[PDB]
């Protein structure tokens, strides 16, 4: 019922009570654990409950739980649901809902910043051009000349599943992927399929290695449209090393604004299918994963060669030596160009602090160890030795089907 | 019910059917996952089934399921159970049980070697002195002058829970740790408490930074006794770096035989409380955890100083650069002395093949991602990108409370 988590390095012991309020499922059972599995239209009777659940916590957060205002709202929404078969959140409810969806994101190590989220209410949007205007404004505001500020833009909620707003890109900004005749892959293998759909829709693919993909926007269920993000808005960073000057020769560059855009935001039962959000990078995301994953830009060997490391045997740890240098470079290049970025040590230390804060001020913090521990130097970051309890609270960010496997043209 | 796991790096999908034969719990519910949590006497009544399930799996494996020998053995066991409230395994079943406990250890990345396990039957042992002799033979056989061989020694099973055999050591070979009055710690911080017990039991600690702990053995529920492992049997490796001539001056060295000795081996419902086992090290266990955890030897700083890295700001990744060098040194020192050891790239690569093989020939491979992925360079090793299913099958290795917390002293 009441659980405890121990940090095996500091012997600290936090007591979790927040999970008692858990709602969704975890994908696990007493028989089997799926902790390492990537991913283990509502009716009126379904919505009333969710809505009630949300308002209670909302009014409870503003210290007016069971007030008249509280009861009034709950009554108004219930009426609206019976009549319209859905409802609209007050601006204050939206902001609270969004900030809390981020607060509950058990896979985000950067949640200590949760309360500072800038919310852009784009619920009055009606067309894809409108979406393009809203997104550009978001990118600009968040980039802030390098002094990144977290943000989220919320388009209209779902109604009947046939008038959904969606951003087909998985991130507002990403590099294109083209399968070459060589059999190899040019650019970013992760977006090969998305790139094909752009071309298949008209994009004039430049066929380069780091071509900023075009936004593909779907408004009110209509077919998606293309737009090219004002280049002057896409801040980028050329990657160099603070010692190896041959580094710049790999011709590597990465964008400064990470902005996940394919997720679904759920607040009080309502579903916001187009809700791009952004913060700033933790070095390892680019350095370790985007650059070295075998299925991404896989630049380990090349960097290994340039370093003249004995790549004859795995035990020389040449892959490890190289991995470290690529990550020093990334962090280096960003800090030099003066763009916000955080290293895995600093970030994890912050998350540990945030966890303790959460356990005392809220009674817990759902965390997914598998995703919290960085992809490099795991055990030398504090979160590795930190036991975690993973559970699903709402408001939340959910995964959702890539629209192309769903859109009825 | 069939379950599927994908590898996000090779898109290869596998199907798990083996989880259907899972029995024990996982600590998890549909409302909460505890996959990152360290750790979430039997009666005739409950023993009959456990014995039957075991004999069935055993007889199926030798391809004699349903045979007369299978049926007689099953009748033999039951008569014995209700006759004596327990039963004795045959040598072959014991060997099979041990090998499968290893095969089912979801936290072990070295399982590709499960079938080559050397099983030593010490079920005829009656005293602590007897246990010590058995333990010396295991260390000697397993070490094999540097060419390590996996092995396990199995002492008498639990009967009434008052006559238990236990190896109070957590590993047969491990360095002492001593709390200094100024708060610091000399030696290995992980063994401070056990070291204190050994001293209290009469051990004359030389108080150095790498003193091999004495064995503290409990036979048939009696009070534990001390034994010094013959020094000529404890193989050690001086730690030096292939290019940093100053590394050797750090005074570091490590033992070559990793032999966990505090677990419990469950086979056919029977409980073996003393079952030390050993294989060989994966570099990271020593170079990442034993040397760099802040709660172990914590040498990152010193190594860092000598290399003169920018230790002013973590964003220089100085910790990360030192970690790599230390692990390179560990792998290099063992290889030079010709002491079996395996780097994490090779072990995880090997474990991924074993796992695929296991799905194909067994219908699954229970695995704990949290423990399989190495403590450094996680995503550049194949297991990181591999979805896994964690569930517990028997035979199995279980945690058991430290004996000093439960032993009823005799004086
Ligand atoms: C400002 C600093 C931020 C940092 C350092 C941070 C860091 C991260 C990291 C390292 C992960 C895993 C990333 C991956 O491996 O793909 C993550 C996941 C996530 N973050 Fe954040 N984040 C930031 C801002 C945000 C914001 C503004 C939100 C939401 C409004 C958010 C919501 C989430 C969610 C839902 C996930 C999981 C996404 C998935 O499943 O792929 N993060 N974040
Ligand atoms: C062949 C050499 C071996 C290698 C390279 C290997 C590797 C490993 C590693 C790296 C771990 C995690 C270690 C830790 O963090 O403490 C592990 C866990 C484990 N191994 Fe092995 N192993 C070997 C042999 C064995 C043998 C012979 C057995 C069984 C008889 C075995 C049973 C286990 C079990 C039960 C665990 C989990 C222990 C726990 O929960 O603390 N391993 N092994
Ligand atoms: C989901 C799979 O186990 C594996 O692909 C995996 C594990 N942990 C992860 N953690 C983080 N932070 N990101 C990704 N992409 C991860 N991917
Ligand atoms: C049990 C805690 O989550 C943490 O201390 C933790 C995580 N992963 C591990 N993995 C391995 N291989 N060994 C140990 N000791 C580990 N310890
Ligand atoms: N720090 C963040 N907000 N990250 C969002 C996901 C970005 C993704 N992991 C990448 O490397 O591009
Ligand atoms: N590879 C093995 N069999 N390891 C057994 C556990 C050893 C433990 N990780 C140590 O560093 O001492
Ligand atoms: Zn679980």
From Swiss-Prot, chain A:
Residues binding L-arginine:
171, 280-281, 285
Where does this protein reside within or beyond the cell?
Answer: Cell membrane, Sarcolemma; Cell projection, Dendritic spine
Q: What is the effect of changing residue 281 to S?
A: 30% decrease of nitric-oxide synthase activity
Q: Which domain of life is it from?
A: Eukaryota
Post-translational modification remark:
Ubiquitinated; mediated by STUB1/CHIP in the presence of Hsp70 and Hsp40 (in vitro).
State the tissue distribution. Answer: Isoform N-NOS-1 is expressed in brain and colorectum. Found in the Auerbach's plexus of the enteric nervous system. Isoform PNNOS is expressed in the penis, urethra, prostate, and skeletal muscle, and coexists with the cerebellar nnos in the pelvic plexus, bladder and liver, and is detectable in the cerebellum.
Positions with a binding annotation for (6R)-L-erythro-5,6,7,8-tetrahydrobiopterin:
36, 370-371, 384
* Residue positions binding heme b: 108, 399
- Give the domain section of the comments: The PDZ domain participates in protein-protein interaction, and is responsible for targeting nNos to synaptic membranes. Mediates interaction with VAC14.
Family per similarity comment: Belongs to the NOS family.
Please describe what this protein does: Produces nitric oxide (NO) which is a messenger molecule with diverse functions throughout the body. In the brain and peripheral nervous system, NO displays many properties of a neurotransmitter. Inhibitory transmitter for non-adrenergic and non-cholinergic nerves in the colorectum. Probably has nitrosylase activity and mediates cysteine S-nitrosylation of cytoplasmic target proteins such SRR. Inhibitory transmitter for non-adrenergic and non-cholinergic nerves in the colorectum.
Indicate the quaternary assembly.
Answer: Homodimer. Interacts with DLG4 (via N-terminal tandem pair of PDZ domains); the interaction possibly being prevented by the association between NOS1 and CAPON. Forms a ternary complex with CAPON and RASD1. Forms a ternary complex with CAPON and SYN1. Interacts with ZDHHC23. Interacts with NOSIP; which may impair its synaptic location. Interacts with HTR4. Interacts with SLC6A4. Interacts with VAC14.
Q: What is this protein called?
A: Nitric oxide synthase 1
Native source species: Rattus norvegicus (Rat)
Identify the taxonomic lineage of the organism of origin: Eukaryota, Metazoa, Chordata, Craniata, Vertebrata
């Amino acid at each position: 019922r009441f659980l405890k988590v121990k940090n095996w390095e500091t012997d600290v012991v936090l007591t979790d009570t927040l999970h008692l309020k858990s709602t969704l499922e975890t994908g696990c059972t007493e028989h089997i654990c799926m902790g390492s599995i990537m991913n283990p239209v509502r009716t009126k009777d379904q919505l009333f409950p969710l809505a009630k659940e949300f308002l209670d916590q909302y009014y409870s957060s503003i210290k007016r739980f069971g007030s008249k205002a509280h009861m009034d709202r709950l009554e108004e929404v219930n009426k609206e649901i019976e009549s319209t078969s859905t409802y609209q959140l007050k601006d204050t409810e939206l902001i609270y809902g969004a900030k809390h969806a981020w607060r509950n994101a058990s896979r985000c190590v950067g949640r200590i910043q949760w309360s500072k989220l800038q919310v852009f209410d784009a619920r009055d949007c009606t067309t894809a051009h409108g979406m393009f205007n809203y997104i550009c404004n978001h990118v600009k505001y968040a980039t802030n000349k390098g002094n990144l500020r977290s943000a989220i833009t919320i388009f209209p909620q779902r109604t009947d599943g046939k008038h959904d707003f969606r951003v087909w890109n998985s991130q507002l900004i990403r590099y294109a992927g083209y399968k070459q005749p060589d059999g190899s892959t040019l650019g970013d293998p992760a977006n090969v399929q998305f790139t094909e759909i752009c071309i298949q829709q008209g994009w004039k693919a430049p066929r380069g290695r780091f071509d900023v993909l075009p936004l593909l926007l779907q408004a009110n269920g209509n077919d998606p449209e293309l737009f090219q993000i004002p280049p002057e808005l896409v801040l980028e960073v050329p990657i160099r090393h603070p010692k190896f000057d041959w580094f710049k020769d790999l011709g590597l560059k990465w964008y400064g604004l990470p902005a996940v855009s394919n997720m679904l935001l759920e607040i009080g039962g309502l579903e916001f299918s187009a809700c791009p959000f952004s913060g700033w990078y933790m070095g390892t995301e680019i350095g370790v994963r985007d650059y070295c994953d075998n299925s991404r830009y896989n630049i380990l060997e090349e960097v290994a060669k340039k370093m003249d490391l004995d790549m004859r045997k795995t035990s020389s740890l040449w892959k490890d030596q190289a991995l470290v240098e690529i990550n020093i470079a990334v962090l280096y290049s960003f800090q030099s160009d003066k763009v916000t970025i955080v290293d895995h040590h600093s970030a994890t230390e912050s998350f540990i602090k945030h966890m303790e804060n959460e356990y005392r001020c809220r009674g817990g913090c759902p965390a997914d160890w598998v995703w919290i521990v960085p992809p490099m130097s795991g055990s030398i970051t504090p979160v590795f030795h930190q036991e975690m309890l993973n559970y699903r609270l709402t408001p939340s960010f959910e995964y959702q089907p890539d629209p192309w496997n769903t859109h009825v043209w």
